[PDB]
């Protein structure tokens, strides 16, 4: 009675959800060396839902693509433009948003 | 010592191809109702390197892509142009080609 493609989509979901789960749990907790910048951070997540393609503010609101960020200030083209970001949560950050969370390219990232 | 894309990559490839082989063993033997010619046929394979955005070649070489081969042949407007393909295998194809494969997109196929 239902169509191919809808049972499909359910099936990739699930498969999805597997694979995003399965990265989280093997990168959270390791920290990562920036080849141009050569700092170190420690993963506390992965942002699925963005990409380089994507924005951040700057602190006057000036937007900036991590593309065009990457480019302008180390001369790095970013070769992979589909991967997530990873997220460093840091330890003062909110009251009862009082610091923005850090983001990192995995293609400029490094395991240890 | 490893690039976090590249660790990120062998896990999606090796949950792709376990989604591909899960959809695969589900849908093949089935047969599909098409809601405009309601015609039946067998799924005997997926073609996941295929979408509707992708090109055949007609009787005379001319080649349609599947996009404008049902808007042009039926009045249809496909919705889902990253879908794969349902590959339907003849009983009387080769020798030692003698018949190409049909091919249908989830998004119009019906299961029974």
Same mark, same amino acid.
């Given at each position: 009675?239902?169509?191919?493609?809808?049972?499909? @989509?359910?099936?990739? %979901? %699930?498969? *999805? /959800? @597997?694979? %995003? #789960?399965?990265?989280? $749990? !093997?990168?959270?907790?390791?920290?990562?060396?920036?080849?141009?910048?050569?700092?170190?951070?420690?993963? #506390? #997540?992965?942002?699925?839902? *963005?990409?380089? $393609?994507?924005?951040?503010?700057? +602190?006057?609101? $000036? /937007?900036?693509?991590?593309?065009?960020?990457?480019? $302008?200030?180390?001369?790095?083209?970013?070769?992979?433009? #589909? &991967?997530?970001? =990873?997220? @460093?949560?840091? +330890?003062?950050? &909110?009251?009862? =948003? !009082?610091?923005? /969370?850090?983001? =990192? =390219?995995?293609?400029?990232?490094?395991?240890?």
């Amino acid at each position: 009675n239902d169509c191919v493609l809808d049972v499909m @989509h359910a099936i990739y %979901q %699930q498969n *999805k /959800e @597997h694979f %995003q #789960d399965e990265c989280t $749990k !093997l990168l959270v907790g390791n920290i990562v060396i920036t080849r141009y910048n050569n700092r170190t951070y420690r993963i #506390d #997540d992965v942002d699925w839902n *963005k990409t380089p $393609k994507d924005s951040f503010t700057m +602190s006057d609101g $000036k /937007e900036i693509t991590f593309l065009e960020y990457y480019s $302008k200030n180390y001369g790095i083209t970013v070769k992979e433009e #589909d &991967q997530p970001l =990873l997220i @460093h949560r840091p +330890s003062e950050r &909110q009251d009862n =948003l !009082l610091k923005g /969370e850090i983001l =990192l =390219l995995p293609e400029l990232s490094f395991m240890t």
